[PDB]
Short mmCIF file of C-alpha atoms and ligand atoms in Angstrom, two decimals:
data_model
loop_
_atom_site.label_atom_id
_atom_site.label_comp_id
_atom_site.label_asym_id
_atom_site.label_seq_id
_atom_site.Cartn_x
_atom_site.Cartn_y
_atom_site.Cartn_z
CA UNK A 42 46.77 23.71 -14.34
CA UNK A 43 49.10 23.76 -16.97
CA UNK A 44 47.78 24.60 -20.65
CA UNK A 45 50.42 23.38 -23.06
CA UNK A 46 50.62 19.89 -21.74
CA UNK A 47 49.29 17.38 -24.59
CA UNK A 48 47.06 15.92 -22.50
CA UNK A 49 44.86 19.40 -21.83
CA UNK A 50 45.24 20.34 -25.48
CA UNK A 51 43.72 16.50 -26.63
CA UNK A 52 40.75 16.95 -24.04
CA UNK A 53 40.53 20.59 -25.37
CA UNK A 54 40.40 20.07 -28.84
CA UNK A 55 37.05 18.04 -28.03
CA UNK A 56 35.87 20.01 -25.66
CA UNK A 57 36.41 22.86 -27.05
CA UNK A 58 35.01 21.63 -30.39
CA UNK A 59 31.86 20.97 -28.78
CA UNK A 60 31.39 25.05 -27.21
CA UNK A 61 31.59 25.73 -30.94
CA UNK A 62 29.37 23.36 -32.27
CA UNK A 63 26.90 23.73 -29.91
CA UNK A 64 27.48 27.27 -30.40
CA UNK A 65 26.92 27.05 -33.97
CA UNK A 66 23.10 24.82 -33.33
CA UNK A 67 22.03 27.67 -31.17
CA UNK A 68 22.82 30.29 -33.73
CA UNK A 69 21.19 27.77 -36.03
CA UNK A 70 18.18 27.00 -33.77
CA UNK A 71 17.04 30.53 -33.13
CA UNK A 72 16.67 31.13 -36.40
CA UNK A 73 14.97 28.00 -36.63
CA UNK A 74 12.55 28.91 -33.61
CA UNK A 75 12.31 32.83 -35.80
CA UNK A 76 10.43 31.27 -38.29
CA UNK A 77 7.87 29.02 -36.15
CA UNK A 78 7.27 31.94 -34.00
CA UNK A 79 6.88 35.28 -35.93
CA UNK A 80 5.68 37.28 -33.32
CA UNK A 81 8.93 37.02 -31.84
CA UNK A 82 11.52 37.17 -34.76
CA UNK A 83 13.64 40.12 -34.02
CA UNK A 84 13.80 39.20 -30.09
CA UNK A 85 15.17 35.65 -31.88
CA UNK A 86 16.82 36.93 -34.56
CA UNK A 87 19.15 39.37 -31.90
CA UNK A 88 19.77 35.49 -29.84
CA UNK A 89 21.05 33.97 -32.98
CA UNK A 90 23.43 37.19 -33.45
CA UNK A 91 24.67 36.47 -29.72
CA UNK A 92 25.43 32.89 -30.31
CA UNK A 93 27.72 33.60 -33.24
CA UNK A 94 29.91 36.33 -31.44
CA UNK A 95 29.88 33.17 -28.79
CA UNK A 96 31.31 30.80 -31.26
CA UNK A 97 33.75 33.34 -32.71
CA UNK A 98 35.28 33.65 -28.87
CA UNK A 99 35.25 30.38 -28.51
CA UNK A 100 37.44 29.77 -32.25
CA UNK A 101 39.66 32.44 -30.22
CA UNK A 102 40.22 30.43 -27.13
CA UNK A 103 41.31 27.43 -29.30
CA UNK A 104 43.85 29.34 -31.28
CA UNK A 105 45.01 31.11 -27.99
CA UNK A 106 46.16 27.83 -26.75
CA UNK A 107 47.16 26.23 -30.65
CA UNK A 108 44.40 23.39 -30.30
CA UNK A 109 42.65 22.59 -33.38
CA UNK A 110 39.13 21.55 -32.35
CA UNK A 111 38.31 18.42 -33.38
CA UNK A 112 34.65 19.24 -34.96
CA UNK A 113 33.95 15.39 -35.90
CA UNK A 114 33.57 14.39 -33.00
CA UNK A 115 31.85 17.40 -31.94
CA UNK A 116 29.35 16.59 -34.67
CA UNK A 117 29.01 13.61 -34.04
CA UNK A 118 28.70 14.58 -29.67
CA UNK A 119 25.21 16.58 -30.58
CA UNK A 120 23.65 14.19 -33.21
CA UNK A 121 21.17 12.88 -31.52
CA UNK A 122 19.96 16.74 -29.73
CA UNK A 123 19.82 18.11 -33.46
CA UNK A 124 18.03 15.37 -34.80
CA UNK A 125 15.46 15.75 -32.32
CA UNK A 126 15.20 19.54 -32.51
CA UNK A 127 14.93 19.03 -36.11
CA UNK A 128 12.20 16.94 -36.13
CA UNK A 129 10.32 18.97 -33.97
CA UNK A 130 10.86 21.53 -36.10
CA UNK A 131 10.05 19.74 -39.21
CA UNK A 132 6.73 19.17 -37.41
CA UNK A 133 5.97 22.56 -35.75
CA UNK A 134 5.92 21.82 -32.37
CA UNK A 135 7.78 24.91 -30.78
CA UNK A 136 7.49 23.71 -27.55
CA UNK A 137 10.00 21.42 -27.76
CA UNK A 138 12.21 23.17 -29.88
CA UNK A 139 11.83 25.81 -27.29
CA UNK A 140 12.34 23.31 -24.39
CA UNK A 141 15.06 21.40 -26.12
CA UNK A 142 17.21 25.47 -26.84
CA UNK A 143 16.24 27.83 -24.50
CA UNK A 144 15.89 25.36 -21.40
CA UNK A 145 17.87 22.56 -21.80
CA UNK A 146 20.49 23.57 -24.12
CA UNK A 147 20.76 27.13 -22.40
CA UNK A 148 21.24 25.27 -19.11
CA UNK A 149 23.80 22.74 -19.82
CA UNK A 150 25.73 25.94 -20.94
CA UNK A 151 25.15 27.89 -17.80
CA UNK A 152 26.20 24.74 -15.94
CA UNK A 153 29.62 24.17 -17.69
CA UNK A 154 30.40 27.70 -18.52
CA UNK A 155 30.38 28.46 -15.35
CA UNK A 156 32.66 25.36 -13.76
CA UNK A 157 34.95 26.39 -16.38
CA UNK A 158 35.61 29.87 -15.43
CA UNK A 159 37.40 29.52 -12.11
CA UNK A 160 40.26 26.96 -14.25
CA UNK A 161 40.31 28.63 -17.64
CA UNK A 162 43.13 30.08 -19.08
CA UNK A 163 43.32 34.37 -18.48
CA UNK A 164 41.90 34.97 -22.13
CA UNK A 165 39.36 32.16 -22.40
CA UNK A 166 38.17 33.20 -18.53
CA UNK A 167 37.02 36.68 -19.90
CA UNK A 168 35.89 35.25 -22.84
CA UNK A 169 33.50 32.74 -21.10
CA UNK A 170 32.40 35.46 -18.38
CA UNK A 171 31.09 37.51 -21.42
CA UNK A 172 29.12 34.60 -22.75
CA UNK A 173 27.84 33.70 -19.70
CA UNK A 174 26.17 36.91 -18.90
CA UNK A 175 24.50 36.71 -22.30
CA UNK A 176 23.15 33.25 -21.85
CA UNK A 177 20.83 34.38 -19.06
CA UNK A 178 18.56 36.23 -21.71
CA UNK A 179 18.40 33.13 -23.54
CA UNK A 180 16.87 31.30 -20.90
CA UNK A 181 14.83 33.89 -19.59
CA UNK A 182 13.51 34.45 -23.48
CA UNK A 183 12.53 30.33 -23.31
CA UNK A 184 10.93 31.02 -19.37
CA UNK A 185 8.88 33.96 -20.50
CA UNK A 186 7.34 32.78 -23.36
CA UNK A 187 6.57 29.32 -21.76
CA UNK A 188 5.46 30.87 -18.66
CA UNK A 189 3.14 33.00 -20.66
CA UNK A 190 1.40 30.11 -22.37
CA UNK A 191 1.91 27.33 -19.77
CA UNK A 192 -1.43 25.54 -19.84
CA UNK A 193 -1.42 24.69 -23.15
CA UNK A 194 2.10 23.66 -23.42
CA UNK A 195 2.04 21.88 -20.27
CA UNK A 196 1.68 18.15 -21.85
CA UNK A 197 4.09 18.72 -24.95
CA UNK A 198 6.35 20.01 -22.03
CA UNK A 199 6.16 17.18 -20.20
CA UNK A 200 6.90 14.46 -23.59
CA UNK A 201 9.84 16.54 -24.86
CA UNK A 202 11.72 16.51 -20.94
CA UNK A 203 10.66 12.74 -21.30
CA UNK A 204 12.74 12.25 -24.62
CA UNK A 205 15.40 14.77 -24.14
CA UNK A 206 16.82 14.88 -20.69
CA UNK A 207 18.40 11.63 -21.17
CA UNK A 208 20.23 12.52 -23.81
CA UNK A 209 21.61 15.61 -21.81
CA UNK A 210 22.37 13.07 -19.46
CA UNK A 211 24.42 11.12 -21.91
CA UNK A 212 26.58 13.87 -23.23
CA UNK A 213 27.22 15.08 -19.21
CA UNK A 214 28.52 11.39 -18.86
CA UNK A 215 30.24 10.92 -22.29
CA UNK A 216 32.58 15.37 -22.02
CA UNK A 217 33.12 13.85 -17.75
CA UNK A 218 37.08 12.49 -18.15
CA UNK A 219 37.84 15.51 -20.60
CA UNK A 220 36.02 18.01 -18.24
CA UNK A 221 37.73 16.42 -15.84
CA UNK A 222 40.91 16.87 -17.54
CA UNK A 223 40.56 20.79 -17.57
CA UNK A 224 39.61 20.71 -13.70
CA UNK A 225 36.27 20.20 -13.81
CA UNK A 226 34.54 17.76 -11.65
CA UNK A 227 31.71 16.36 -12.88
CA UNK A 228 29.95 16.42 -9.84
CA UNK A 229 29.53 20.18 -10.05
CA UNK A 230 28.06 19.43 -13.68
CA UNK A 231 25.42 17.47 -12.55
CA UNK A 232 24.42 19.69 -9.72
CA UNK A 233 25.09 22.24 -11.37
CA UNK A 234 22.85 21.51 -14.26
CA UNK A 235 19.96 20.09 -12.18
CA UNK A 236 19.65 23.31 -9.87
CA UNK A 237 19.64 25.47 -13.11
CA UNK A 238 17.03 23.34 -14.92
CA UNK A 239 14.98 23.07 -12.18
CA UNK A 240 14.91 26.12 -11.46
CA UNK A 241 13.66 27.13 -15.03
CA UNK A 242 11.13 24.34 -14.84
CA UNK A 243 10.04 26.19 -11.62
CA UNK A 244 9.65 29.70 -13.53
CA UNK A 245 7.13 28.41 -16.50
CA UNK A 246 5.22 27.56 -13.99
CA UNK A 247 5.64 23.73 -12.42
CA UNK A 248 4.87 22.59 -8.61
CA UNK A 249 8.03 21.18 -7.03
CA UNK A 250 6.78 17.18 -7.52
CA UNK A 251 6.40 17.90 -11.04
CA UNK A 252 9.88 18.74 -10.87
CA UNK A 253 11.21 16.26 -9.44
CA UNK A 254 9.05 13.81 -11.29
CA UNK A 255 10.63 15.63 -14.43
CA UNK A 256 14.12 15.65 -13.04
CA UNK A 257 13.83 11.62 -12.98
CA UNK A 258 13.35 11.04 -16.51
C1 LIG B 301 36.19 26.46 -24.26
C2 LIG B 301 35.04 26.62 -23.18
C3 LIG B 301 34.90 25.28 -22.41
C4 LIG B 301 33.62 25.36 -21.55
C5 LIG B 301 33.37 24.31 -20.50
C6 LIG B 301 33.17 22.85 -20.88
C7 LIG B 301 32.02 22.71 -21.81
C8 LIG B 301 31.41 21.31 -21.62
C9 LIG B 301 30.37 21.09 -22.78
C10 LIG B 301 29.14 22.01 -22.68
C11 LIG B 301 28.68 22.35 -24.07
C12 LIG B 301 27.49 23.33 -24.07
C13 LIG B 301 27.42 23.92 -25.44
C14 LIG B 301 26.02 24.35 -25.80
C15 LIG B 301 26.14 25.80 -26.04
C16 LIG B 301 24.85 26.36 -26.24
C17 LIG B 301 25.22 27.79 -26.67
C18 LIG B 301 24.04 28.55 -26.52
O1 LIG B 301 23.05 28.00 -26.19
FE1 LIG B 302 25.77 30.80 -26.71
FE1 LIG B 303 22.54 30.50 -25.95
#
């Protein structure tokens, strides 16, 4: 792959725009989810303090290859994901803020960061292996806590997978020809994605029909 062509910095600056932005609503979202759930504010508080050293690597990979991210469109890529957390929020229902960060977001993440890693650039590589190892905690924070109250957060579960896994469907379909671009095949995304969300949905505690019921929506 070659780095300084100005087709890989144009797909970069967007995709590379959206790391950071979605970087900066995690950050945001923990903090967020600190204030709903008080029993767990320094565990949250020390996730929001991982997502900005995240976003600060990622502002580094862009100026290691002289893209200027294009954060418009990056805004404009997660509109629809904050809006929803943010109503959820606005309402109290942790659950879905919970499912919406720490499962969905979390695995999306997991998904790309790791298809990226085997066709990044030397510095963004190590970069991206660093945040990668940290995002494990964040989904294992979201499994942990919904394992632990399952029952009761079963059916809220259930409505915020029904509203939000389309839209992570939408923005895996709408980054595919940049991803693409950098030598990732969207294929692996969706797999990729699926196995790691299923998997969670698996640890809180649902049978495999549930998951695959859930995977459908
Ligand atoms: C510069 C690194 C490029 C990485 C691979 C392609 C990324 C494809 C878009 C995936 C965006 C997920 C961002 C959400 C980050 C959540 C951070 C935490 O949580
Ligand atoms: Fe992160
Ligand atoms: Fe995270």
């Amino acid at each position: 792959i070659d780095f300084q062509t100005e087709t890989y910095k144009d797909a970069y600056s967007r995709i590379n725009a959206i790391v950071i932005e979605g970087e900066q609503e995690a950050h945001d979202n923990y903090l967020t989810l600190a204030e709903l759930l008080a029993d767990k504010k320094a565990e949250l508080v020390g996730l929001s303090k991982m997502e900005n050293r995240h976003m600060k690597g990622f502002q580094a990979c862009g100026r290691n290859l002289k893209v200027t991210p294009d954060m418009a469109f990056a805004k404009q890529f997660f509109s629809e994901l904050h809006k929803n957390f943010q109503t959820a929020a606005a309402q109290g229902q942790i659950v879905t803020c919970l499912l919406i960060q720490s499962l969905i977001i979390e695995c999306f993440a997991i998904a790309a960061y790791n298809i990226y890693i085997p066709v990044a650039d030397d510095f963004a590589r190590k970069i991206t292996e660093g945040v990668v190892k940290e995002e494990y905690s964040h989904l294992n924070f979201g499994e942990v806590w919904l394992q632990a109250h399952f029952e009761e957060s079963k059916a809220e579960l259930e409505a915020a997978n029904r509203q939000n896994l389309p839209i992570i469907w939408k923005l895996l379909n709408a980054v595919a020809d940049d991803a693409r671009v950098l030598g990732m095949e969207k294929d692996a995304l969706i797999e990729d994605f699926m196995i790691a969300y299923g998997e969670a949905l698996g640890n809180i505690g649902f049978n495999n029909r549930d998951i695959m019921r859930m995977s459908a929506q």
